[PDB]
Design a protein around this ligand. Sequence first.
Ligand code: YB
Ligand code: YB
Ligand code: YB
Ligand code: YB
Ligand code: YB
Ligand code: YB
Ligand code: ZN
Length: 607
Amino acid sequence: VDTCSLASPASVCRTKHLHLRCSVDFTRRTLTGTAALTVQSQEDNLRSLVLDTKDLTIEKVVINGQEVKYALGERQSYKGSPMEISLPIALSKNQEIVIEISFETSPKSSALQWLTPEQTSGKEHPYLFSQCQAIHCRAILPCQDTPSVKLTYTAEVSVPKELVALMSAIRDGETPDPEDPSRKIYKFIQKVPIPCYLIALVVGALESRQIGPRTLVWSEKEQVEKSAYEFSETESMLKIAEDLGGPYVWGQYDLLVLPPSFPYGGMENPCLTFVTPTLLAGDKSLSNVIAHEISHSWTGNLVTNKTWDHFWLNEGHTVYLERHICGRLFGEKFRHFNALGGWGELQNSVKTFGETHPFTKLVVDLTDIDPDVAYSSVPYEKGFALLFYLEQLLGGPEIFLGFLKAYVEKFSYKSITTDDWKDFLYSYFKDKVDVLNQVDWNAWLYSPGLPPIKPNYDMTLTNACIALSQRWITAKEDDLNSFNATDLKDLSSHQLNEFLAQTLQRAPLPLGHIKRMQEVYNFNAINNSEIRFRWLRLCIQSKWEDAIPLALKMATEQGRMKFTRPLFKDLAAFDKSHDQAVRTYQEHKASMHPVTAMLVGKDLKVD
Ligand SMILES: [Yb+3]
Ligand SMILES: [Yb+3]
Ligand SMILES: [Yb+3]
Ligand SMILES: [Yb+3]
Ligand SMILES: [Yb+3]
Ligand SMILES: [Yb+3]
Ligand SMILES: [Zn+2]
């Protein structure tokens, strides 16, 4: 059973299809319409069922032309309120009915952010975007809000005609709204069965540019040109991924480049990947995020975690695939560079939560825990570390990629657990059961902290990063004028980034060191969001007062949680900026993304 869901489980009934008819109301900040759910009974004599909801207003439920009885339980925090629906007649096993629920979302739906015109690039129009992973789809529409159920869907969305609607689906046309001359209806169809967390909607002043045979980039006009360039390697990445995982089954692969308050680096919404505009470095160096989202078209979207306890299946395999894409593009030495950097990130998150903290476990029991609170890089990097370790244990990347593709085929269109994965691992590698049996599975899977064994990493591209970092860390005052802009001359931006990551792990540095570093390297002027992020953290943790406005500015002028949360935490920990940080959070809170606002509030202990 999915302990994050209050709905009837898949053993009871299964949603097979959703038809959403809705209208996006910017004045009231509500989605209004009808969710028609085709539900199939898995049990004899089924007379009722329960759906997840969250701050939804139910207008009426209709099954076969007649309204039926329903009730809503008490709100269980982030889990929302269970909705019990009495069926007009009892269903046999495998029998299907269509349940048509009329509803309105609340303006505070945790799935949605409503932007005023001033919160956009163009400043003339409002903007709406959704984000359902993990369990926010219930805040959009009634559903079995669990990844253990997969459904196709169709949608018709009415919006002000000056705007554009897009969804995680194939575009299926547009018409004027028959009921409203100032609106348009955009139609969508998703023919591949998906978990409902992959449902997504955006509505705004969007423009499109074609950058591949199956890829348009969508954004506000201000960001389109930069985006087309930044993500120009998307189709090449797509093709590599198809080599690694088998055919792309989803048809289109479009990119949506959101406004700055989008909470994630990317979200793998099918047919339409969402991405932060903070990826726009100007040199494509952050496009590994694109590789990542692309990889999810197999690991996650095709093979899906059955519950969020097994989220590492989604993220670990995807990062594994992601780094293989980067490796094929730029070389095995680079794959190792990124992999080693991943381990560095794992070190960090483990130090942040603490080595006994439950959230550093690979498999986590999320019964009474908000997935948003448990979210971290642990499932990504401990997950990857496990797979990278197995690769080396079992004969190398060629052999382990054989397993990956077999795994994807085996479980395509299915929802699985960590046990299903490991069972298949053993079945695939049945000839090496004796090596597999030497693995500390219980430590790897269920113990907190760093994993029991570190993989082997090629150091070639990381050495120059380490050397420069160690020079700065061991440098005394009379060494400072020995640093020179020429230190950076033969370093890629990745290497710059890794140098800053290495140095940050040893923060703080003396104020004098930090001030010299700005003098000779001028990271203040760097556009790269990752680099600027680590630099500003280094500055704030080194107590440089001058950096406070820049840090506050980055934390608030964009909203990627990866950046906004640690910057706010760093600012709150620095006495000179503490009250300023908390004050800035509270002035911006109402205009922040709902999830981000919640996490930062918790991070700063503002209640
Ligand atoms: Yb039953
Ligand atoms: Yb029966
Ligand atoms: Yb304003
Ligand atoms: Yb069509
Ligand atoms: Yb098993
Ligand atoms: Yb010296
Ligand atoms: Zn991912």
